[PDB]
């Protein structure tokens, strides 16, 4: 509402909630009153190769434009630059993984003289700096202590939640469930996956699962595809950076190193 720069960048680790933030922000615009005319949501996460074609398809479909399939990409980009310049637009870019030129995809870069805005989310602060969003960066932080717990509770079945929800009656199962929740580090993706994995835990099994979750996470359901999802930030690295990152994993947990 108030920021001077018209390009806004949101950055955070994988699974912190950037895409969900964009969803809840786009859905929130239809509730309030605003001067903007189109709110376009674009998924650049499809690839790092920048598939121009379906991004232009989304922009044209969102602008009530006819899809001239045989038109060259550059001509369509110029046409979209002309078209988007006539409207006060908001474009929400999702998980942009490389620097890409907006004018080659059809999006005009918003400037001070224009009311249009452009919000992009990415795991890398370097990308948000490359896309001229340095003066309006936001860090997407992990969830709080209580919000993470009440997210974990909603992920459990009714009978299972009936064991860890109640207070007044005191038992160690609440402590074990809280230990499992804290093992997720407040990462919403972690809360979802871990709560789904242990959504049907019986009363007597919480102890062993909580004890094992503190040391390893290979035997728990659904975490393999989690690490596959989060692994791209590691695969992007050069081999020296990969070795330097793995070298840091052998330091003690919960311990800051110099």
């Amino acid at each position: 509402e108030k920021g001077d720069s018209n390009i806004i960048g949101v950055w955070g680790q994988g699974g912190v909630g950037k895409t969900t933030l964009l969803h809840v922000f786009n859905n929130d615009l239809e509730k309030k009153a605003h001067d903007y005319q189109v709110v376009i949501f674009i998924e650049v996460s499809n690839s790092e190769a920048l598939n121009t074609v379906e991004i232009q398809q989304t922009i044209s479909e969102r602008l009530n434009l006819p899809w001239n399939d045989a038109e060259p990409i550059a001509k369509r980009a110029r046409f979209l630059i002309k078209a988007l310049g006539r409207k006060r637009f908001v474009i929400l870019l999702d998980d942009v993984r490389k620097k890409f030129c907006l004018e080659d995809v059809g999006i005009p870069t918003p400037d001070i003289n224009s009311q249009s805005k452009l919000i992009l989310t990415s795991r890398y602060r370097e990308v948000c700096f490359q896309m001229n969003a340095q003066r309006s960066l936001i860090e997407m932080q992990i969830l709080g202590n209580d919000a993470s717990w009440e997210l974990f509770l909603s992920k459990l079945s009714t009978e299972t939640s009936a064991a860890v929800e109640p207070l007044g009656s005191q038992s160690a199962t609440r402590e074990h469930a809280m230990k499992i929740a804290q093992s997720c580090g407040g990462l919403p993706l972690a809360l979802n996956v871990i709560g789904t994995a242990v959504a049907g835990l019986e009363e007597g099994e919480w102890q062993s699962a909580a004890d094992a979750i503190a040391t390893n996470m290979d035997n728990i359901d659904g975490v393999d595809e989690m690490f596959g999802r989060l692994k791209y930030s590691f695969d992007r690295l050069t081999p020296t950076q990969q070795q330097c990152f793995l070298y840091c994993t052998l330091f003690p947990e919960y311990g800051s190193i110099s």
């Binding site: 009656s169 049907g200 007597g204 099994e205 062993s208 094992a212 035997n219 359901d221």
Partner: protein, 458 residues
């Protein structure tokens, strides 16, 4: 679940992780390949069609199994069928003689549990069992066991409830052994001093065994450097005060049996506070035992299952009113105690789940003289042979109970169960019609209601 996970650990399917076995069991029960069933979720079972599917898949596989359990087999199967099989199971059969020496080169598992009459196993039976990793002879009648120097790779050996008296010396040369169980071995009397050569062992169990560490001379278990969990029978106060110091041999015990206890006329949980892993206590034939102290001083150890059996002089146990070490109790079994006359403390047991009261005519009532019921988490009640019991307890709400069973109780006057409760968890009630005649009722409709809803005659 625990027994199956033990085998999954010995077989090498689990990389020394029990939680991995629990995860596998849960994955199977979530795919409907196994069913959790029983008075407690600790037991799993297979649907009949699913078991037939498993057998069909085994037959379709290239690794043969020899599977004849529960078949009421009167004689062992032909030794020629044992050639190519890898898993052998002769559970719950009536096998009486095992004389042949099989050619089981590829076998990695032998099960003979619940063979009540198998007591003559031919010497040299294990000659070809070099790769045998799991060997179970639980609940069999064997008194001697064939030499086993050929068992190079054995890691699990169970002999619970068997009549083995002396244990052959070849076991101390089994370098790969990891778990050895001889619980409730009535006839076992062989010294374990050679267990020091069994360095690799991780678990050793002698719970309720008639023989154990009768004197400090056999307290050399500090040589068991790899040990994690142990259960043994302790016989004297001086042994306890030799073990009442913080060290792994004292704290590694998860359960104790107390039999022929000398000079232990009284015992306090504070004395057991150094047993940080202890969870179950068994007291049998403690002639001079008089009182027990259930202190308010809490312990990291969580007492879960207790069984008081054949105690001719125990009188009372002092339990604190506000906080106590018994609040983590799950199962209570009270048996054969004629002079015991104080069990009022049960009403403070809010995590209690199982009740077993039998042959204790000294108990007048299970509960004699917060807006909460005294048994909020109770699941099972078992009553048997009480010739002088009057009633269980005062009128309280029992909505979470699952099953009630009363047998041979011609003196029981009434039960706290009533139609005032809401019931969805009460699965069944089993008992005698004479007890129903002698039963007092809160309402005269309960004569027919509690009969037509849950009562199952014996």
């Amino acid at each position: 679940k625990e027994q199956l996970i033990g085998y999954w650990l010995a077989e090498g399917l689990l990389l020394n992780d029990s939680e991995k076995g629990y995860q596998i069991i849960r994955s199977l029960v979530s795919a409907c390949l196994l069913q959790v069933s029983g008075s407690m979720s600790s037991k799993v079972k297979m649907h009949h069609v699913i078991r037939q599917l498993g057998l069909w898949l085994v037959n379709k596989s290239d690794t043969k199994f020899l599977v004849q359990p529960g078949m009421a087999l009167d004689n062992a199967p032909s030794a020629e069928e044992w050639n190519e099989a890898t898993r052998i199971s002769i559970m719950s059969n009536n096998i009486t003689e095992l004389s042949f020496s099989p050619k089981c080169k590829n076998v990695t598992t032998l099960l003979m549990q619940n063979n009540p009459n198998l007591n003559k196993m031919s010497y040299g039976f294990f000659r070809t069992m070099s790769s045998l990793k799991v060997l179970d002879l639980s609940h069999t009648a064997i008194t001697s066991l064939p030499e086993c120097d050929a068992l190079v790779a054995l890691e699990h050996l169970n002999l619970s409830h068997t009549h083995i008296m002396r244990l052959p010396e070849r076991l101390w040369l089994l370098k790969e052994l990891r778990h050895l169980d001889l619980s409730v071995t009535v006839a076992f009397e062989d010294t374990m001093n050679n267990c020091s050569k069994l360095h690799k062992l991780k678990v050793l169990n002698l719970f309720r065994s008639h023989y154990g560490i009768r004197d400090v001379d056999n307290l050399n278990l500090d040589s068991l450097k790899e040990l994690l969990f142990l259960g043994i029978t302790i016989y004297a106060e001086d042994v306890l005060k030799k073990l009442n110091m913080p060290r792994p041999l004292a704290k590694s015990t998860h359960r104790l049996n107390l039999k022929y206890c000398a000079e232990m006329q009284s015992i306090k949980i504070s004395d057991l506070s150094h047993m940080e892993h202890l969870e179950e206590l068994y007291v049998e034939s403690c002639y001079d035992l008089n009182t027990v102290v259930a202190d308010a001083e809490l312990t990291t150890s969580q007492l879960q299952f207790l069984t008081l059996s054949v105690l001719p002089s125990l009188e009372s146990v002092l339990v604190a009113p506000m906080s106590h070490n018994f609040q983590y109790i799950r199962k209570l079994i009270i048996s054969h105690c004629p002079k015991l006359s104080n069990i009022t403390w049960v009403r403070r047991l809010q995590l209690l789940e199982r009740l077993v009261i039998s042959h204790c005519d000294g108990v007048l009532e299970i509960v004699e003289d917060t807006g909460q019921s005294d048994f909020p988490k109770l699941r099972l009640i078992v009553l048997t042979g009480l010739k002088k019991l009057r009633s269980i307890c005062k009128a309280r709400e029992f909505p979470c109970l699952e099953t009630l069973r009363v047998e041979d109780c011609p003196n029981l006057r009434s039960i706290p169960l009533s139609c005032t409760h809401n019931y969805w968890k009460l699965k069944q009630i089993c008992g005698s019609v004479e007890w129903w005649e002698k039963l007092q009722w809160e309402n005269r409709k309960e004569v027919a209601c509690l009969d037509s809803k849950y009562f199952i005659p014996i």
